């Protein structure tokens, strides 16, 4: 529940128009703003009044209201659209505090699958004169968001020290993420090679390091 | 052309009092417009917080009124937040906007600074290079980095070479390991042509526990 409420997820197909609707009491004497937030960077402005959009967005977004609805618009949408799109105006009541809607998150279907870049690092002189190893295996450029990362040392699979994010978006709308491989000295030294492997979409890539 | 930039402690103890500032440039903070307030959780929506036009005239959010005082500093030319009996929930990125005086909207937005409520206490980060070698090197083309590890709490600022090195470096989310601290790396894709010449450093920075460090990475 809130105040100018908004669909929590929709989807559009590439190059396809869709339609973002926020509804509140407050809309009625109110023109709702529009803005666009991709992830880790601060909101953008797109939409407000009445169909007015900033110097720089461009002219596939526009903006409607009728009643106590608005509605931001994205006509053929592209890959640099899929983001998290947020409702505000100010409320009617007392001294008219601004008020969000719960944003939206704007899935664009349809973009080209993209494999793992891995890159695995061994432990560092430094760490290991700290009586300290860890592994580091960076995972970027990869879509769909989705990655499965085994550990093993040698040929056997390892579970234990191993730590890996989620998903994140990078600019170019793929998705990185980082496994992190926590071992003593001695057992990075007593054994021949660690290996790093992430499958996506069925597929596996595998990077192997090795004390020397 | 107006540009916000946020400033803040980063770590707050429970019940204590959140203090931020907004430095302004382009634009006189004595002004009509609307200067603001705005924060974000973890993963959540963004919410409101308050607004101050004139250098007098506040507004804030109701679930907020009694802990907020939004003031501005005129000499300096810039505006201020304190957030008052803090808990977990206030834990947000905080940013700094303008909304003019008529449709109301915030045009212009700070780059945001991070929050975080907690009793735990501060942990500077250990800094070790990420050595490129033939392991790391395809082609032409070698990876080399930067391992930023055991620190409390978010965030941790990576640049390469004082900025002047942008160009393929991957900085990736920080892991929120078992024991409670933060670990991340930050990668740079070099010509591996380069190694021998060019000399990369990243500079790690973590105010909250006054960890600046610039790491030289050279091959062993």
């Known amino acids: 529940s809130s105040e100018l409420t908004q669909d929590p997820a929709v989807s559009v197909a590439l190059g396809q128009t869709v339609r973002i609707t926020c509804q509140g009491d407050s809309l009625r004497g109110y023109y709702a703003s529009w803005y666009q937030q991709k992830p880790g960077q601060a909101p953008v402005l797109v939409i407000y009044?009445?169909?007015n959009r900033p110097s720089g967005i461009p002219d596939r977004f526009s903006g409607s209201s009728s009643g106590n609805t608005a509605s931001l618009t994205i006509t053929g949408a592209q890959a640099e659209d899929e983001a998290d799109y947020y409702c505000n105006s100010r409320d009617s009541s007392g001294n008219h505090p601004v008020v969000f809607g719960g944003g939206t998150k704007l899935t664009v279907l349809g973009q080209p699958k993209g494999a793992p870049s891995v890159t695995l690092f061994p432990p560092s002189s430094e760490e290991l004169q700290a009586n300290k190893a860890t592994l580091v295996c960076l995972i970027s450029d990869f879509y769909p968001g989705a990655v499965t990362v085994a550990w093993k040392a040698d040929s056997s699979p390892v579970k234990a020290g191993v730590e890996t994010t989620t998903p994140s978006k990078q600019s170019n709308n793929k998705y990185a993420a980082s496994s992190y491989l926590s071992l003593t000295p001695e057992q990075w030294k007593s054994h021949r090679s660690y290996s790093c492997q992430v499958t996506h979409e069925g597929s596996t890539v595998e990077k192997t390091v090795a004390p020397t | 052309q107006v540009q916000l930039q946020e400033s803040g402690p980063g770590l707050v103890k429970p019940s204590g009092t959140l203090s931020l500032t907004c430095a302004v440039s382009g634009g006189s903070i004595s002004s009509s417009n609307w200067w603001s307030w705005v924060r974000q959780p973890p993963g959540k929506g963004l919410e409101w917080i308050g607004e101050?036009?004139?250098?007098?005239?506040?507004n804030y959010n109701p679930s907020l009124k009694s802990r907020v005082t939004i003031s501005v500093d005129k000499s300096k030319n810039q505006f201020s937040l304190k957030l008052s009996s803090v808990t977990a929930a206030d834990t947000a990125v905080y940013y700094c906007?303008?909304?003019?005086?008529?449709?109301?909207?915030?045009?212009?937005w700070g780059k945001g600074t991070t929050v975080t409520v907690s009793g735990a206490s501060t942990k500077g980060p250990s800094v070790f290079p990420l050595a490129p070698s033939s392991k790391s090197t395809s082609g032409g083309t070698a990876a080399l980095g930067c391992l930023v590890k055991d620190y409390f709490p978010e965030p941790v600022t990576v640049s390469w070479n004082s900025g002047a090195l942008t160009s393929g470096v991957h900085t990736f989310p920080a892991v929120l390991q078992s024991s409670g601290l933060y670990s991340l790396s930050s990668v740079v894709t070099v010509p591996s042509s380069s190694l021998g010449t060019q000399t990369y450093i990243c500079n790690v920075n973590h105010k909250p526990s006054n960890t600046k460090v610039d790491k030289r990475v050279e091959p062993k």
């Open positions: 009044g009445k169909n």
């Open positions: 906007a303008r909304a003019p005086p008529y449709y109301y909207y915030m045009d212009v």
């Open positions: 101050i036009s004139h250098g007098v005239y506040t």
